[model samples]
Target: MLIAIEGVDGAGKRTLVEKLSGAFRAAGRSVATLAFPRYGQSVAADIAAEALHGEHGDLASSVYAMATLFALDRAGAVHTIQGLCRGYDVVILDRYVASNAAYSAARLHENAAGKAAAWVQRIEFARLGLPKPDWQVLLAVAELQQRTGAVYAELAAQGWGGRWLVVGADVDPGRLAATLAPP
Candidate 1:
């Protein structure tokens, strides 16, 4: 299983990934972990990080361009991820394909047509051949604007409500798997 944890900048996504990974191990599941923007490892991710920090002025200004950078970063990691999946029972990602979809959609700011989100998915999963996540856990923090934008609109368009496990910042990691298990 490939599980993704997503949220805005300060939404505690990394912390959640840590807890979930720990819980999975405690439950006897073999797991491998990855976090994106692979700054030191991937050149695409390094470039994206630089652009995000304003080192390359207009690069970050274009939504498609920025999204492409993120997508490329993930694309470059596909082989490693695949190998991890083959060896482990679970592959937990701190930020995966959904982050690109959500961030791009939020940038589009509720374009009801959902063209941005749709393109994001096509670019990352289709064109780039990155794996689709088995489950996506959205950590919504009240003050984060990124959580309430075209992301939901896009998810609605994709009919992904049943696949997404929405939770608050205070959700317990140990209970997360239980909550998501078959009823």
Candidate 2:
């Protein structure tokens, strides 16, 4: 199973991933995990980060170009993710295509079903052939990230991927783990 946990930078995604991994393991499932934009590890991600931080002049100003860089970063991880899928009962991704979709569309002042988001889905999953998540999660934090949060909520409501789920502070990690990785 491929599961993605997606949200804005300060949305407690790491905390949830940790809790979810522990819950899945406690339920007798072997789990593997990866965090996207592998920072110093993936060249594409590194370049993208640099662009965002003003290293590559005006690079981050182009939404599609930035999205492509992010997509390329995930493309580089395809082999590792496939290998982990074969070896583990569950593979949890810290962020995935949904992150790209939400942020890209939000940057364009568009919603989930907007062309930019659809373009992201096409280029990443269809054209690039990255692994599609068996489950897609959204942790919406509207106060801090209204556009991203709204786009994510729209995606979840529209069931953008397989078994899309919206997560909240009240959701029980154990129950979510069982639902996602049943014994």
Candidate 3:
């Protein structure tokens, strides 16, 4: 099975993914895991990140490019993902194409709202051949303000603090769920 866990930054996605992968391993099932952007390992990710770094570009200018890179990154891992699915009982994708679509869409040109979501879908899924996960887990952290202290404290524990987006800057969780959720 291919499982994808998606959420905005600081939403404990990595924590849950770690826990799930460990749990699957402890349950005696073979497992493999992959994270999106595939970062250090993917040439496409490098290209995208390089292009986006401090470039001051709108979402329209960057999203499709980044999503395309992500899809390309996934393509490089397809054989590995397939191999794992064939040999292992479980495979976990910590951050899939959904992340690119959401985050990039959020960053798009304000005027491109109408085009953003649709473009992400086309670039990330249709044109790129990226597929959806069998199980999609969307994490929602609604009490961010009330949890501010704890959230900052958690970030502090990880040797970081005080980095947050203004409200409405990132993709809306509700919108993501509505767009990606199954029929």
Using lDDT as the measure, the top candidate is 2
Q: lDDT of all the models against the reference?
A: 0.74, 0.86, 0.57
TM-score of each: 0.85, 0.94, 0.66
lDDT of 1 by residue, 1-183 (tens): 888776674448888888888888888888788998787988888888788789787898887888788888888888999999999988988877777767666666644247776787777777888887888887765322644434653563464522777788888887996664322
For candidate 3, give the lDDT of residue 19.
63
Off by over 4 Å in 1: 9-11, 111-113, 142-144, 147-162, 180-183
The digit string of per-residue lDDT tens for model 3 on 94-176 reads: 76755554565455532212465456556655765565566655454424332332332232233221121222224443343
Give a tens-digit lDDT track for model 2, residues 1-183: 999998885458888898899998887888998998788898889999889889888998898999999999999899999999999998999989988998888888998878998998889989999988999887655442788888888888888856788878667889888777666
State which candidate has the highest TM-score. 2
Candidate 1's TM-score: 0.85
Question: Which of the two, 1 or 2, has more TM-score?
Answer: 2
Model 3 spans > 4 angstroms off: 55-61, 109-114, 142-183
Score candidate 2 by lDDT: 0.86
